[PDB]
Design an enzyme around this catalytic site. Structure first.
Site, short mmCIF file in Angstrom:
data_model
loop_
_atom_site.label_atom_id
_atom_site.label_comp_id
_atom_site.label_asym_id
_atom_site.label_seq_id
_atom_site.Cartn_x
_atom_site.Cartn_y
_atom_site.Cartn_z
CD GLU D 99 -2.84 -1.00 -0.15
OE1 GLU D 99 -3.72 -0.13 -0.28
OE2 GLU D 99 -2.57 -1.85 -1.02
CD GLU D 129 -4.00 2.76 -2.77
OE1 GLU D 129 -4.21 2.04 -1.77
OE2 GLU D 129 -4.32 2.43 -3.93
CG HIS D 132 -5.98 1.31 1.79
ND1 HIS D 132 -6.13 1.05 0.44
CD2 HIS D 132 -7.19 1.74 2.22
CE1 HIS D 132 -7.37 1.31 0.08
NE2 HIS D 132 -8.03 1.74 1.14
CD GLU D 194 -5.32 -0.52 -6.63
OE1 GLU D 194 -5.64 0.06 -7.69
OE2 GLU D 194 -5.10 0.09 -5.55
CD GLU D 228 -7.60 -0.99 -3.28
OE1 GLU D 228 -7.28 -1.01 -4.48
OE2 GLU D 228 -6.97 -0.36 -2.41
CG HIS D 231 -8.27 2.54 -5.48
ND1 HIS D 231 -7.46 2.02 -4.49
CD2 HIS D 231 -8.68 3.75 -5.03
CE1 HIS D 231 -7.38 2.87 -3.49
NE2 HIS D 231 -8.12 3.93 -3.79
FE FE Z 1 -5.78 0.93 -4.21
FE FE Z 2 -5.02 0.34 -1.63
#
Ligand code: FE
Ligand code: FE
Lengths: 392, 166, 133, 511, 387, 73
Positions: D99, D129, D132, D194, D228, D231
């Site tokens: 991350e 991120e 995370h 991802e 995510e 993302h």
């Molecule tokens: Fe991500």
């Molecule tokens: Fe992430």
């Protein structure tokens, strides 16, 4: 039913719980229950911020303060390392010495931002309900705000966009957070200026919330012209992240943005009977102070006062400071010509008031930054150099 | 052998580094060290596990020697071998552009990185030139990636096979 | 039927799985038009699944398959899956926007977008074959 | 004036975001690249700073509320099987470093963008991120607080450099996302890393942890997965932007194939090993999960439906499928052979695990169970015997090699997966490669891969010296962090390893 | 130590064996029988409504029989004799904002934390150097400090309302309004204390504000009005109508918004507007609930419309006369400030008074039949203005 | 002017809470009672309308998060 067999959790299933309880030993195998006890604490005792943030980035030994060994597994084409000492001019013994005085990690940060957002929504609803927009100066509302407060957001956006190189090339974990937070503050300031303009448009009929006129003023009008140039020289002129942070948060911002937001809009908004701009200038000032604390801690303490690389860093700091201070003066001299578009008010709009405001800004900058790194500045020369562009 | 973080190889090299007192001598020393031990085309592999630390020490010593016998203009817009930074960039860009094969462009890029790397050259000038060269190098290497057979690729690279499992 | 978690090869073990896994025809990716949505298991998600997905979405899309896992719901469907935040706000008796719904949503294998107060997911390629609004 | 209570929603503010950018001469990317992004590109999710902060605040409240109230009162710390705790010791730290490097890749993607909405979306990712990373650190902190084996949970960031698996993780996460073209990093982090690997990783970790009596990981991991979702939207959005340009059609397929092979070569062997060999109660075989989540979901919905643009199934799918079935076992053998170099406790399979392995993987018995039973009979666990499997492997003719490109241990004699050993000589240096794609990558660009393998750094050094220098001992200063069993008694010390007398032999010198 | 029934194996097995497999009832909605004002039932109504046990002889009751214990002399614990207004259902009032404990405390905590951060930043920047000397020395130190006594009296006026209310949402609304008033008072002092901390020579003591509040003629009449509400009357409906709908909405609105905020902006003050914005928000939030209670429920009752309207008109006229007297006494402060065209001259004061009275006329008076002309009131107030 | 980051603690506000009350003829209780309370009584646990809100908000967030997320799953 379902095709996949239902999984039985081991916390509540009787047989699994019995087996797990049988397997678990009856005594602890170690006594040290402190997360990352080997981190040197800046203050009296380790904080959660230090434990969660420090030593996150895996750095080899040849980078100062590293712990791992060996080269990087994969590199750019031609052999440029992913991270290295070639990305900046300033040197230091340890890159892990920087600590945010506010002790900010993700959760408190987002909590405070959410607080501010919800309070702003409630205040906007109440202000709309009570109808306080009536007691405002018409000329100040329709000729100054919509034309220049909407042009300042482009400066805000440029300063925000300047942070991508700092975010990618930075060599420590603590510093990567401060830069990201600063950048988020700048973009949030720009989005408020736009939200305030939209809210004003939604109340008074005949008010245009489009950005065409502010964009034309930003890209064509001489008043902002010089300022625009400075932003470009920070956005794409340079790639050193230390230089970017110093030029965009310690020299250009702390003078020009302070004068524009505080000494002109915030004060004249009150003087001309406006009760809405101060609510946003307050948030801008709070964000600026929070960023200033971290920038000062990073530069004055860790770098400019390094036990072995002090003078070497001070030389580069002075070399950058003189150039960017000259650019910021030229921007201020170009900008100060806006005073001919407002009604004369004794002590706030005449020459004496402008001189006093410039002296205040330059004295504050000299106390905060220049005296710490040994820079020599004489306010009177800067003040009358700026006022040379003031028209009577 | 010796511990990772504390070995005699490092003490000796640091001791011989400490006796440097001029910009030109330090520049020659760092250029020779970078050419000798800091490339896949290096002359010797004996100092493999310690050359980056020594390079860091040399860079720090050269940077300290600078900012004491040079002017601000020299520190900003002039390379440390007495040549203007801007010309060097143009000359090496032209040299890379004149390249015709993917095996010469990489050699030019490696030589440029070995010769002119900070603190020899200003950081901004270096980074810009590095990006410009990398663009061309990438563009050249990513054409017909899977066309060449493996044996022909081995012959072109010049390696010799010692063991080859069936 | 074909949208179940254990469908086709999954229903085969031992040597059967071994031989069909290494089959010649199975070495090339096969295009599929399904969508997979994993939802975190909480007080609201339970209400939405029991009152909306299994009542209205099933009526509109009869191919929706819902699987109850250890700590999340696994929903595989054909076409698209759409949820309206206004209906959830009315159902839960508390203010509820699309963002609050996005808080709980865990994962997606398809193209998902929020329009107004409606969160939707689809296999259709966006930008390539449909201009986003 | 009309007096009615009104407000401003984020949608109106986001509607005017496209016009925030003005064009000048020097408006260009700061990094080398081969593609040109489109000037105008829409954003699927409309978010601003305020709204993002509110959503993140909401999530953080419940998560930290439940973790510090409910499980703390219920005493869930000491209700986890020891093997799953040992597995978490590695999983949490590795995910944290992944991350953290994802933070830097997104900034480079933010830098490379040209539209305001893209910069906003990239900026959001940068902030997530970071969240995370902090959440994974918090998982490690909570385990260190309440678990019955604090060691290895409180100083993982210092003792993780000794192990061999670290080098491989750094290649697929520390260097695979922040090196090369800006787009290369996009496809390597969003379209593949991802949308194809973290999905199964997070869902399977939450499933297996629940099956083994764990309750912190289900709580925190499922939160990480929510962010995510967006993302992947950002990843799709950049793919279309660079598409329809003449360059994309000449490089995108090669970029995708390289990214897919690089990533799979490590997660496939590691995740399977950590799941099957590091749990007491097993949900389903790893190959079935790999087929469910990678070959049929990602390939059938993402790669399959992208036939529109020039995207084809990767040419290395057959090798990946072949390695899915036996690599986890091949890596587990080497991981068991070098237990003292790790920072977690390990346990050999027992009769029930052996029966499960034989039932699910035919032929596992005659190849691996015999080796494991031999090892067990020769005192693999008792400190006195003074037996280390590395010496047995060296004396029995087998050897352990590390690939120069992928940095993954490989045993040619006891391997059933794809690949073979190749040794090359260049400029008076010997290199070892284990596959065709890695060999092609090394032959094409030899300047990118120059890392030092495990054996070169520790050549001619006895084991006790290395372990002690790396701070791999407990509080008492003489008990190793890593043990060959999960029991609470008969722990190995430094004197036992000293009596074992192991020395690294530099295997490449025999050629 | 203690064996919990959720994790112990034997206890969990016994509990699982005892628990039946299928549910016994299909109604899972909490308090489904409550009539929903909006489209669907909300958590606010579910948790708030019908919490008070009321017999049938009180309108909209559910229980039966007399109270178990009464006051000496047989006075009932809650009776119909505590108010003049009548209705067919006392459980009809709903807060437009749908406020119960958790959202309310969340909002207050948000405001408090933001205030602390803003104060820290303002102190750090030292923006106090631009304040006017005269405005800071005399007006803010004395009259702004005196206003908190009016705030405190209005806050104390709610004591009897909480004990006598015959519903369960009216109690919450009254308590929240009182807390808002005391919050306003505490801020006026917090701001005074902060200013004292920054600028040397500034006194934060309350002796001078108390002296001015109890002796100076400017506030004199206003003070009397507060007393008339604090202890003059005991009917809770009358207390709420006089305190919020009539006295506050005119006098407090004019004082806080039309004088301190406007003149503070004109005289270059950047601190006072921040503190007055919170008071304005609190006033609007309280006004919404008060209007909902008094217009939708009582004045528009399908059986007791004119009955309630008569008392409302009488109270409105009496307390409007009181408020006009207070404003006429207060408008004499304009002689202590520097003259500014359009803000301090007669035209500005007249415009402000017309604006305030027109806003009142639109918001509250036209809903209950009251007849008022703004020009007369404005002239009556301006008769006490020194030109 | 002194430019240092300072704030106002709730103690300082609570110190002046005693003087917020002023007397008059009718300042008496409304209900029937047999006792008279002292006019100079101090109170432990000094609080204002802000500390109470902060503490209650923290407690509510902690319990509502746990109840609505952990026990439910
Ligand atoms: Fe991500
Ligand atoms: Fe992430």
């Amino acid at each position: 039913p379902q095709s996949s067999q239902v999984t039985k959790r081991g916390l509540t299933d009787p047989e699994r719980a019995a087996i797990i309880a049988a397997a678990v030993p009856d005594h602890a195998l170690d006594t040290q229950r402190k997360y990352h006890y080997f981190i040197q604490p800046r203050w009296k005792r380790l904080s959660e911020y230090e434990q969660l943030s420090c030593y996150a980035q895996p750095n080899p030994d040849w980078i100062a303060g590293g712990l791992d060994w060996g080269d990087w597994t994969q590199k750019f084409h031609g052999g440029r390392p992913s991270w290295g000492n070639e990305s900046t001019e300033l040197r230091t013994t340890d890159w892990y010495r920087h600590r945010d005085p506010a002790r900010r990690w993700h959760a408190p940060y987002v909590k405070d931002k959410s607080e501010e957002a919800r309070y702003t929504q409630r205040f906007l609803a109440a202000y709309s309900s009570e109808g306080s927009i009536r007691t405002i100066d018409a000329y100040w509302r329709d000729e100054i705000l919509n034309k220049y407060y909407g042009a300042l957001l482009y400066n805000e956006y440029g300063l925000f966009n300047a942070h991508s190189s700092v975010g990618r090339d930075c060599l420590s974990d603590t510093i990567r957070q401060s830069a990201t937070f600063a950048g988020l503050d700048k973009v949030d300031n720009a989005q408020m200026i736009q939200m305030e303009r939209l809210f004003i448009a939604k109340l008074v009929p005949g008010f245009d919330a489009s950005t065409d006129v502010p964009k034309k003023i930003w890209t064509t009008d001489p008043i902002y012209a010089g300022a625009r140039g400075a932003v470009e020289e920070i956005w794409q002129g340079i790639q050193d992240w230390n230089e970017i942070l110093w030029a965009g948060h310690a020299v250009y911002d702390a003078t020009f943005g302070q004068f524009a937001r505080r000494e002109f809009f915030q004060r004249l908004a009150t003087v001309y009977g406006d009760t809405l701009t101060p609510f946003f200038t307050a948030q801008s000032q709070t964000y600026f102070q929070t960023t200033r604390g971290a920038i000062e801690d990073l530069f004055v303490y860790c770098l400019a006062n390094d036990p072995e690389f002090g003078a070497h860093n001070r030389t580069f700091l002075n070399a950058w400071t003189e150039h960017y201070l000259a650019r910021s003066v030229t921007a201020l001299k170009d900008f100060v010509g806006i005073y001919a578009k407002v009604e004369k008010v004794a002590g706030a709009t005449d020459r004496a008031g402008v001189s006093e405001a410039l002296q205040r800004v330059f004295g504050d900058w000299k106390v905060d930054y220049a005296d710490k790194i040994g820079f020599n500045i004489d306010v009177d020369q800067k003040v009358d150099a700026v006022l040379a562009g003031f028209k009577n | 052998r010796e511990p990772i973080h504390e070995n005699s190889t490092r003490t000796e090299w640091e001791g011989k580094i400490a006796k440097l007192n001029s910009v030109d001598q330090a520049t020659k020393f760092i250029q020779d060290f970078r050419v000798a031990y800091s490339s896949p085309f290096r002359k010797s592999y004996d100092l493999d596990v310690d050359y980056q630390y020594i390079e860091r020490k040399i860079e720090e010593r050269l940077s300290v020697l600078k900012t004491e016998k040079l002017s601000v203009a020299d520190l900003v817009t002039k390379a440390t071998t007495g040549e203007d930074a801007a010309a060097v960039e143009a000359a090496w860009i032209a040299k890379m552009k004149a390249a015709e094969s993917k095996y010469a462009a990489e050699r030019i890029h490696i030589e440029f990185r070995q010769l002119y790397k900070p603190p020899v050259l200003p950081v901004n000038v270096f980074l810009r030139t590095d990006a410009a060269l990398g663009t061309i190098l990438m563009e050249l290497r990513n054409t017909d990636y899977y066309a060449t057979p493996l044996e022909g690729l081995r012959k072109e690279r010049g390696v010799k096979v010692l063991h080859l499992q069936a | 039927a074909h949208n179940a978690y254990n469908a086709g090869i999954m229903q085969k073990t031992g040597k059967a799985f071994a031989d069909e896994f290494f089959a010649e025809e199975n070495q090339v990716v096969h295009e599929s038009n399904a969508v997979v949505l994993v939802l975190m298991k909480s007080d609201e998600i339970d209400a939405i699944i029991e009152d909306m997905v299994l009542k209205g979405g099933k009526a509109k899309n009869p191919s929706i398959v819902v699987e109850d896992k250890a700590g999340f719901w696994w929903i595989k469907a054909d076409g698209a899956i759409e949820i309206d935040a206004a209906e959830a706000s009315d159902l839960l008796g508390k203010p509820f926007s699309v963002y609050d719904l996005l808080v709980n949503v865990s994962s997606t294998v398809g193209r998902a977008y929020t329009l107004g107060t409606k969160f939707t997911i689809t296999s259709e390629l966006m930008g390539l074959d449909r201009a986003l609004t | 004036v009309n007096r009615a209570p009104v407000g401003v929603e984020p949608q109106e503010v986001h509607k005017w975001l496209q016009s925030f950018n003005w064009d000048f001469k020097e408006n260009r990317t700061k990094y080398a690249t081969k593609y040109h992004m489109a000037n105008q590109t829409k954003e699927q999710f409309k978010v601003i700073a305020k709204e993002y902060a509110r959503m993140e605040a909401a999530k953080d409240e419940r998560q930290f509320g439940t973790l510090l109230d409910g499980l703390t009162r219920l005493g869930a710390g000491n209700k986890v099987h020891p093997r799953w705790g040992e597995t978490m010791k590695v999983i949490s730290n590795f995910l944290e470093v992944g991350e953290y490097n994802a933070i830097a890749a997104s900034a480079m993607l933010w830098d490379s963008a040209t539209a305001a909405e893209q910069k906003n979306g990239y900026l959001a990712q940068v902030l997530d991120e970071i969240r995370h990373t902090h959440q994974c650190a918090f998982i490690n902190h909570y385990y260190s607080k309440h678990y019955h084996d604090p060691a290895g949970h409180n100083d993982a960031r210092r003792t993780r450099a000794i192990g061999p698996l670290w080098k491989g993780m750094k290649r697929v996460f520390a260097d695979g996302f922040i090196s090369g073209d800006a787009v290369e990093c996009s496809v390597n982090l969003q379209l593949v890393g991802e949308a194809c690997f973290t999905n199964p990783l997070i869902v399977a970790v939450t499933e297996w942890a629940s099956a083994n009596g764990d309750e912190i990981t289900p709580t925190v991991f499922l939160s990480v997965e929510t962010d995510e979702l967006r993302h992947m939207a950002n990843g799709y959005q950049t793919v279309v932007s660079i598409a329809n340009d003449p360059a994309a059609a000449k490089y995108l397929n090669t970029d995708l194939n390289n990214a897919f092979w690089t990533q799979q070569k490590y997660f496939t062997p590691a995740l399977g090993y950590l799941f099957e060999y590091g749990s007491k109660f097993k949900v389903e075989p790893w190959v079935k999960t790999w087929n469910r989540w990678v070959y049929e979901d990602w390939g059938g919905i993402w790669i399959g439906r992208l036939g529109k643009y020039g995207v084809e199934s990767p040419r290395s799918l057959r090798d990946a499928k072949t390695d899915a079935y036996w690599a986890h076992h091949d890596l587990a053998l080497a991981a068991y052979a070098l237990w003292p170099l790790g920072f977690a406790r390990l346990a050999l399979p027992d009769e029930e695990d052996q029966e499960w392995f034989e039932a699910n993987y035919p032929g596992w018995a005659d190849h691996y169970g015999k080796i494991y039973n031999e090892w067990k009979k020769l005192g693999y666990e008792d400190p006195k015997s003074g037996f280390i499997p590395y010496a047995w492997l060296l004396a029995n003719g087998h050897d352990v090699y590390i690939d120069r490109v992928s940095q993954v241990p490989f045993i040619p004699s006891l391997a059933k997966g794809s690949g073979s050993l190749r040794v090359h000589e260049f400029n008076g240096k010997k290199h070892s490669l284990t596959d065709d794609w890695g060999e092609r990558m090394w032959l094409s660009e030899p300047e990118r891969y120059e890392c030092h393998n495990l054996f070169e750094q520790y050549e001619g050094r006895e084991l006790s010296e290395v372990i002690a220098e790396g701070h791999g001992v407990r509080s008492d200063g003489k008990t190793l962090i890593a043990q060959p069993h999960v029991r609470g008694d008969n722990l190995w010390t430094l004197e036992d390893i000293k009596r074992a007398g192991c020395v690294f032999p530099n295997p490449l010198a025999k050629f």
